[PDB]
Design a protein around this ligand. Structure first.
Ligand SMILES: */C=C/C1=C(C)C(=O)N/C1=C\c1[nH]c(/C=C2\N=C(C[C@H]3NC(=O)C(C(*)=C)=C3C)C(C)=C2CCC(=O)O)c(CCC(=O)O)c1C
Ligand SMILES: */C=C/C1=C(C)C(=O)N/C1=C\c1[nH]c(/C=C2\N=C(C[C@H]3NC(=O)C(C(*)=C)=C3C)C(C)=C2CCC(=O)O)c(CCC(=O)O)c1C
Ligand SMILES: *[C@@H](C)C1=C(C)C(=O)N/C1=C\c1[nH]c(/C=C2N=C(/C=C3\NC(=O)C(CC)=C3C)C(C)=C\2CCC(=O)O)c(CCC(=O)O)c1C
Ligand SMILES: *[C@@H](C)C1=C(C)C(=O)N/C1=C\c1[nH]c(/C=C2N=C(/C=C3\NC(=O)C(CC)=C3C)C(C)=C\2CCC(=O)O)c(CCC(=O)O)c1C
Ligand SMILES: *[C@@H](C)[C@H]1/C(=C/c2[nH]c(/C=C3N=C(/C=C4\NC(=O)C(CC)=C4C)C(C)=C\3CCC(=O)O)c(CCC(=O)O)c2C)NC(=O)[C@@H]1C
Ligand SMILES: *[C@@H](C)[C@H]1/C(=C/c2[nH]c(/C=C3N=C(/C=C4\NC(=O)C(CC)=C4C)C(C)=C\3CCC(=O)O)c(CCC(=O)O)c2C)NC(=O)[C@@H]1C
Ligand SMILES: *[C@H](C)[C@H]1/C(=C/c2[nH]c(/C=C3N=C(/C=C4\NC(=O)C(CC)=C4C)C(C)=C\3CCC(=O)O)c(CCC(=O)O)c2C)NC(=O)[C@@H]1C
Ligand SMILES: *[C@H](C)[C@H]1/C(=C/c2[nH]c(/C=C3N=C(/C=C4\NC(=O)C(CC)=C4C)C(C)=C\3CCC(=O)O)c(CCC(=O)O)c2C)NC(=O)[C@@H]1C
Lengths: 163, 68, 80, 162
């Protein structure tokens, strides 16, 4: 539960422990600072493509179910963001994905809908990392983040595979 | 699995040039450069929650954009 | 002023090609595509919870990141 | 409590406002992006002036931030209704009447509202004209600049008033 602060010498060290530390931190900043939209756009895209999901027999029907789906999509996004901070997917694969498919099966949370919500978040995050905007309309120094984008994509692919 | 439905909430502070917030949260040693002494990452395992108002507003967006 | 902080919620239903039937509209038929289209308006109290607000603060506090392809206006100094 | 306008009544409404179908698309572009429009506006106001979330700033604390996010949504929605109606009377009376005085008494900063409303205006105009990053709604391609400018005019009434 305790918040950790990594700055100064500890942040300098973290940048020696992971590849492309500065770019990595920019990528994480983009995702976390836009998290509500990334999540809402993914869940609402899943729904707009399959409106049955908010019909009365749909798994997102009622605020409570919508809230649970938005929450889970945020949980997944956050474990991906943390994977990108860390340079690996171990915590994502254990804490987030471990037992998740079985949990969803016991609750009746639909695999097709999850695949689409996750797929949209993937596209969105990859696009934030491979942002081709002019420098004037770009918050970070312009350059090539394709390796990190592919890394991020790989983390989403692990979620897709598990679910 | 996480029984409490926690996830890591990460906050990224590029605070280079900020004069008005005292950089006191990070308690370790300094690096001797602005790229690290005026930058900080915050990480906290946090129960992830979505309130009724947020879910209700997403539903309003959805209802006006359902594809035929 | 509105003492109850209500605002108009406008909802746009273009239900052409939507195979689910809805009949909240009680007026006459047009006998064309408008029978599959509806605008809903209601006055509802607008509210944002402090929990949501706390989540938004965490998104906003880094002070650098933006949507894709938008002007950058961020500053590190107090303006007002 | 809600009004439903479909069938004959909607066919009629479309004749009583200019460019009825395009106008409904333009309204759709606002209401189906309501959460992110509000977010961008408050976020941008803050990144330009971070003092707003310093301990002495007007968005400090979840209570103040929640009120600002709420107010931004209120303003956005009265604008969306003005665009549906082709008329700003309700916006000017119910929303904007007494608001400048209200904000003057509370110390809600005018420069902050100027910027937030300005960002909502730019974001709505972009969604209406389909120049935004995202273009999720389907329309025949065309020129919606008149409706975008009408929308911008409603935001300009907000800015003028505040
Ligand atoms: C909301 C966060 C975003 C900010 C801020 C920004 O500047 N762009 C953001 C999001 C974003 N979304 C996508 C891709 C998709 N979004 C959807 C959902 C949307 N589409 C719909 O039809 C409906 C319902 C009417 C929605 C709510 C979808 C389906 C996609 C495409 C997913 C895919 O490619 O399979 C992106 C990625 C854009 C890109 O690839 O360049 C961003 C950045
Ligand atoms: C609602 C999320 C968005 C999706 C999805 C999408 O496709 N576009 C989205 C947002 C959007 N924003 C703007 C315009 C602006 N946003 C800001 C705030 C932003 N800039 C910053 O420096 C910071 C803090 C680091 C922010 C949070 C600003 C300042 C603008 C421009 C305002 C102005 O020009 O007056 C637009 C419109 C883009 C355009 O005007 O071309 C969209 C679509
Ligand atoms: C097609 C998109 C669709 C499938 C397939 C599915 O399973 N569900 C679908 C749509 C859907 N619509 C709604 C809610 C409303 N639809 C409305 C449209 C009309 N109402 C009318 O009277 C007319 C004729 C003029 C329409 C074209 C309205 C007004 C809706 C809101 C009603 C309300 O106030 O609650 C939903 C939401 C679930 C539901 O309420 O049925 C869904 C999933
Ligand atoms: C400059 C951008 C600025 C003006 C002007 C202003 O009025 N407020 C400004 C910044 C600001 N920062 C914060 C919060 C945090 N800043 C942090 C940065 C560092 N902490 C450190 O110890 C170091 C050295 C490695 C940093 C680079 C951190 C970690 C913040 C979070 C604190 C927390 O978790 O509570 C705010 C929010 C209000 C405040 O705490 O001052 C503002 C407005
Ligand atoms: C892909 C991710 C996007 C992108 C990134 C990009 N960033 C840089 C350079 C820097 N980024 C930072 C950022 C931070 N360092 C920190 O400690 C923190 C806070 C914790 C942040 C936010 C830094 C310090 C640099 C170094 C240069 C500078 O000081 O300005 C580059 C340049 C290449 C490099 O690796 O240095 C790039 C390409 N660029 C894009 O176009 C993508 C959208
Ligand atoms: C700017 C607003 C964008 C744009 C709009 C645009 N729309 C049309 C045409 C139509 N739009 C609708 C939409 C609705 N009618 C309804 O009753 C409802 C539900 C309440 C909706 C959402 C309709 C029915 C049409 C007519 C065409 C059709 O049969 O689908 C146009 C075409 C020109 C015209 O005036 O008809 C345009 C240009 N186009 C853009 O490029 C902007 C992003
Ligand atoms: C959203 C894209 C999809 C969706 C989601 C949805 N989820 C639930 C319920 C639960 N989800 C979890 C998830 C986790 N357990 C873990 O250990 C982790 C890793 C940290 C996760 C992500 C759990 C435990 C539940 C049950 C407990 C709870 O919900 O509080 C629901 C159902 C909520 C309900 O039954 O009321 C839904 C709808 N639904 C969809 O349709 C999307 C595909
Ligand atoms: C957000 C962009 C800005 C901001 C907002 C802010 N507003 C308040 C408090 C109130 N806002 C209103 C507004 C209205 N009254 C009406 O009748 C209507 C039209 C329907 C509106 C929009 C009112 C009445 C209040 C006071 C009552 C209440 O809060 O419920 C606050 C809180 C002020 C405080 O200290 O309590 C804030 C922060 N703040 C900014 O900095 C942005 C510029």
């Amino acid at each position: 539960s305790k918040a950790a602060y990594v700055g100064g010498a500890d942040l300098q060290a973290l940048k020696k422990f992971v590849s492309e530390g500065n770019k990595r931190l920019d990528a994480v900043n983009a995702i976390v600072s836009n998290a509500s939209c990334i999540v809402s756009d993914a869940v609402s895209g899943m729904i707009c493509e399959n409106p049955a999901l908010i019909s009365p027999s749909g798994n997102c029907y009622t605020n409570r179910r919508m809230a649970a789906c938005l929450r889970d999509a945020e949980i997944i996004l956050r474990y991906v963001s943390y994977s990108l901070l860390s340079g690996d997917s171990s915590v994502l694969e254990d804490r987030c994905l471990g037992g998740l498919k079985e949990t969803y099966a016991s609750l009746g949370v639909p695999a097709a809908g999850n695949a689409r919500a996750v797929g949209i978040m993937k596209a969105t995050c990859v696009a934030f990392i491979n942002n081709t905007s002019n420098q004037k309309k770009l918050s970070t120094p312009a350059g090539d983040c394709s390796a990190l984008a592919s890394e991020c994509a790989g983390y989403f692919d692990k979620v897709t595979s598990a679910l | 699995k996480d029984a409490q439905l926690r996830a890591p909430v990460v906050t990224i502070f590029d605070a280079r040039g900020c004069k008005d917030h005292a950089n006191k949260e990070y308690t370790g040693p300094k690096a001797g450069n602005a790229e690290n002494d005026e930058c900080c990452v915050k990480v906290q395992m946090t129960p992830i929650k979505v309130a009724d108002d947020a879910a209700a507003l997403v539903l309003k967006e959805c209802l006006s954009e359902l594809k035929g | 002023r509105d003492a109850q902080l209500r605002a108009p919620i406008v909802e746009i239903f273009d239900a052409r090609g939507c195979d689910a039937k809805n009949a909240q509209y009680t007026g006459p038929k047009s006998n064309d595509m408008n029978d599959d289209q509806c605008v809903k308006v209601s006055m509802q109290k607008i509210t944002v919870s402090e929990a949501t607000a706390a989540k938004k603060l965490q998104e906003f506090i880094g002070g650098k990141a933006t949507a894709i392809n938008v002007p950058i206006i961020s500053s590190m100094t107090k303006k007002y």
